[PDB]
Amino acid sequence: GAMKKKWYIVLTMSGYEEKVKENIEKKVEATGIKNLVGRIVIPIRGGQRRKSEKLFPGYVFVEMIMNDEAYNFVRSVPYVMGFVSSGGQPVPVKDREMRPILRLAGLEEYEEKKKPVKVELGFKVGDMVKIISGPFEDFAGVIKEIDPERQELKVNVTIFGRETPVVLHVSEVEKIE
């Protein structure tokens, strides 16, 4: 419903995301349409300690009110290739799926981190590892690479129907078995 605002994924060209975000800010300024567009988020932003460098290339997260004037205004966005969707307009993202984007996007700050325990043994590449610490806490992933000497394990998380490797601390994830 237009009254309620949801978050959709805007399609773009890797490298033009920052431009798309700014284009939207002014696109609504010259049109004074600050009611169709709301807050824009980007999976690229990461913790200051480490930058994911664009978690999803060409993929951007934006919240806006659905409507005929909103679709025609967003679709007309410069540098925008369209929006991810099954039929027409794009579909809203499940809040549970944004949890990791809002937390990393700085949209939500929570604690839940009093379980500083390092996990080791039964750890191997390809093995299945579950996340339990960080912005993706509670996320299941597969061990893609193990970096010894530092206790770090690269895991591939399945987000947006796509697989993507994430850098985390071995003590921040669990290898189930």
Side-chain angles (χ1 to χ4, degrees), residues 64 69-83:
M64 305 185 298
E69 299 179 348
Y71 180 89
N72 292 344
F73 170 89
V74 293
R75 173 52 174 102
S76 75
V77 168
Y79 310 101
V80 155
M81 302 308 290
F83 312 97

Side-chain angles (χ1 to χ4, degrees), residues 11-167:
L11 235 317
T12 185
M13 298 182 67
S14 193
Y16 298 90
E17 298 180 349
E18 300 181 349
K19 294 189 190 235
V20 175
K21 182 181 189 250
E22 184 186 3
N23 296 328
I24 298 170
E25 184 187 358
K26 300 179 187 272
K27 192 79 200 216
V28 163
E29 180 186 2
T31 61
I33 302 188
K34 298 184 190 91
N35 296 346
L36 288 155
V37 178
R39 298 180 201 141
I40 297 176
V41 165
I42 323 188
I44 79 182
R45 296 189 187 270
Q48 186 181 353
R49 294 183 70 157
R50 294 185 187 88
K51 213 186 164 78
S52 67
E53 192 178 357
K54 320 222 164 88
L55 206 298
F56 302 92
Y59 270 24
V60 184
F61 306 140
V62 65
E63 199 203 353
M64 305 185 298
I65 81 186
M66 185 182 301
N67 195 55
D68 293 350
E69 299 179 348
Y71 180 89
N72 292 344
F73 170 89
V74 293
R75 173 52 174 102
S76 75
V77 168
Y79 310 101
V80 155
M81 302 308 290
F83 312 97
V84 185
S85 86
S86 320
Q89 60 286 345
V91 303
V93 188
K94 189 188 186 181
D95 193 2
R96 296 191 190 131
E97 288 200 352
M98 308 180 70
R99 282 193 155 178
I101 301 312
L102 289 7
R103 167 64 166 61
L104 175 115
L107 300 186
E108 180 80 21
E109 301 181 349
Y110 70 89
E111 287 180 2
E112 197 186 349
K113 64 185 198 78
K114 71 183 189 103
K115 200 110 133 137
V117 186
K118 310 183 173 119
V119 179
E120 298 184 352
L121 229 86
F123 66 96
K124 303 199 182 218
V125 65
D127 281 26
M128 226 185 256
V129 76
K130 174 173 84 101
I131 296 169
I132 70 173
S133 319
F136 295 94
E137 280 152 11
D138 327 338
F139 209 124
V142 185
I143 297 313
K144 186 180 191 296
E145 301 182 352
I146 330 183
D147 203 342
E149 220 191 325
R150 305 178 182 60
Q151 319 186 318
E152 300 178 351
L153 257 147
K154 267 171 243 311
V155 195
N156 224 22
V157 180
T158 304
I159 320 161
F160 298 102
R162 300 159 86 66
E163 289 159 5
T164 288
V166 53
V167 286

